Design an enzyme around this catalytic site. Structure first.
Site, PDB file in Angstrom:
ATOM      1  N   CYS A 182       0.883  -1.233   0.226  1.00 60.01           N
ATOM      2  CA  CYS A 182       0.292   0.196  -0.169  1.00 60.01           C
ATOM      3  C   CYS A 182       0.738   1.569   0.442  1.00 60.01           C
ATOM      4  O   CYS A 182       1.655   1.703   1.145  1.00 60.01           O
ATOM      5  CB  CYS A 182      -1.186   0.346   1.406  1.00 60.01           C
ATOM      6  SG  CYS A 182      -1.647   1.509   1.524  1.00 60.01           S
ATOM      7  N   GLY A 183       0.208   2.081  -0.736  1.00 61.11           N
ATOM      8  CA  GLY A 183       1.318   3.281  -1.216  1.00 61.11           C
ATOM      9  C   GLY A 183       1.796   4.389  -0.176  1.00 61.11           C
ATOM     10  O   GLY A 183       2.475   4.698   0.115  1.00 61.11           O
ATOM     11  N   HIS A 184       0.367   4.426  -0.216  1.00 56.90           N
ATOM     12  CA  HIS A 184      -0.029   5.555   0.952  1.00 56.90           C
ATOM     13  C   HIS A 184       0.310   4.939   2.399  1.00 56.90           C
ATOM     14  O   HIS A 184       0.921   6.463   3.655  1.00 56.90           O
ATOM     15  CB  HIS A 184      -1.771   5.290   1.936  1.00 56.90           C
ATOM     16  CG  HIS A 184      -2.215   6.604   0.656  1.00 56.90           C
ATOM     17  ND1 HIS A 184      -2.634   7.849   0.569  1.00 56.90           N
ATOM     18  CD2 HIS A 184      -2.497   5.580  -0.911  1.00 56.90           C
ATOM     19  CE1 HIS A 184      -3.414   8.098  -0.876  1.00 56.90           C
ATOM     20  NE2 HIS A 184      -3.394   6.654  -1.856  1.00 56.90           N
ATOM     21  N   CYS A 185       0.665   3.439   3.008  1.00 52.77           N
ATOM     22  CA  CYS A 185       0.941   3.164   4.145  1.00 52.77           C
ATOM     23  C   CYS A 185       3.097   3.243   3.705  1.00 52.77           C
ATOM     24  O   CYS A 185       3.410   4.042   5.117  1.00 52.77           O
ATOM     25  CB  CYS A 185       0.661   1.854   4.182  1.00 52.77           C
ATOM     26  SG  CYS A 185      -0.590   1.180   4.173  1.00 52.77           S
TER      27      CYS A 185
END
Length: 112
Positions: free
Chosen positions: A30-33
């Site tokens: 997950c890029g946001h993570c």
């Protein structure tokens, strides 16, 4: 810094603690993570300095800790949950700035 928690370590670390825990549930793709990782670490350093560990920041990879993911109804990432002694967790509803996270942490410290 940021404590990595697991299905096996969570209840003794968190539920049986006299400290408040802010826990980021994440997925490894997950890029946001991934974007949040460095800001979470920075917040964790400042919180450690301000509270001397009375508030702790932690992380759980929900994809390999599915007992926790089920228990806390993790349905999206990242999800930050706040745990205080003897209570169900509450969702963090602020931003990822250091000031936002540290503000919530000090609020928790004041009352814990």
């Amino acid at each position: 810094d940021v404590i990595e928690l697991t299905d096996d370590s969570f209840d003794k670390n968190v539920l049986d603690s006299e400290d408040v825990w802010m826990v980021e549930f994440y997925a490894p793709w997950c890029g946001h993570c991934k974007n949040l990782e460095p800001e979470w670490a920075a917040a964790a350093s400042e919180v450690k300095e301000q509270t001397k560990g009375k508030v702790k920041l932690a992380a759980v990879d929900a994809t390999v800790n599915q007992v926790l993911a089920s228990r806390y109804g993790i349905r999206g990432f990242p999800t930050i949950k706040i745990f205080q002694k003897g209570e169900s967790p509450v969702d963090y509803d602020g931003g990822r700035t250091r000031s936002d996270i540290v503000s919530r942490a000090l609020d928790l410290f004041s009352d814990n």
